[PDB]
């Protein structure tokens, strides 16, 4: 079938656009990173990584 | 003509097969609260009163 | 089950879950105790014999 | 990460949700029990009228 959408209709019938973004957060490979900026690296010391 | 707030008017329904699923029709329903029961299993249960 | 949807299902049966735990624990921690005084019992009974 | 784009009704915006049924939830689009991520959703009656 198919919704009617009128400007006369009231709110709750007028059309809503969605749009949904699903993530993959778990432990594999990165794919996309956020903004942050790589550094050097550090052995055998007691550090945060 | 909906009763005024200080004098409310309370009707009883009897016996019936209610569906409480067209009332989306009726009234554009905006919002949908409820306590207990939840919307999604409300049309499968029989009520007392 | 039947009357509520899965969403706040869950915290319900969290909520009672975690009682039934709490309420059986009790019954063993008990259990030991008796079956400890029990033993102690049975081996004065041992060296009477 | 994926993103999902569509337009619904105003009244069917509460059925995107794990554990929900309906029209909508139950024919067209349904989530899983443990999505993770996020919706948007905003009023296009400027746009469909």
């Known amino acids: 079938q198919s919704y009617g959408f009128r400007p006369t209709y009231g709110v709750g019938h007028q059309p809503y656009r969605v749009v949904v973004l699903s993530f993959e957060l778990l432990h594999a490979p990165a794919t996309v990173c956020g903004p942050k900026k790589s550094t050097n690296l550090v052995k055998n010391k007691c550090v945060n990584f | 003509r909906f009763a005024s707030v200080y004098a409310w008017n309370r009707k009883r329904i009897s016996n019936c097969v209610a569906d409480y699923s067209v009332l989306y029709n009726f009234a554009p329903f905006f919002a949908f609260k409820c306590y207990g029961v939840s919307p999604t299993k409300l049309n499968d249960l029989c009520f007392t009163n | 089950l039947s009357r509520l949807d899965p969403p706040e299902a869950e915290v319900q049966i969290d909520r009672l879950i975690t009682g039934r735990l709490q309420s059986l624990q009790t019954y063993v921690t008990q259990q030991l105790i008796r079956a400890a005084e029990i033993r102690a019992s049975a081996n004065l009974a041992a060296t009477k014999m | ?49």
């Open chain 4, 1 to 49: 990460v994926y993103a999902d784009s569509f337009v619904i009704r105003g009244n069917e915006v509460s059925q995107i949700a794990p554990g929900q049924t309906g029209n909508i939830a139950d024919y067209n689009y349904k989530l899983p029990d443990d999505f993770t991520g996020c919706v948007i959703a905003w009023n296009s009656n400027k746009l469909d009228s």
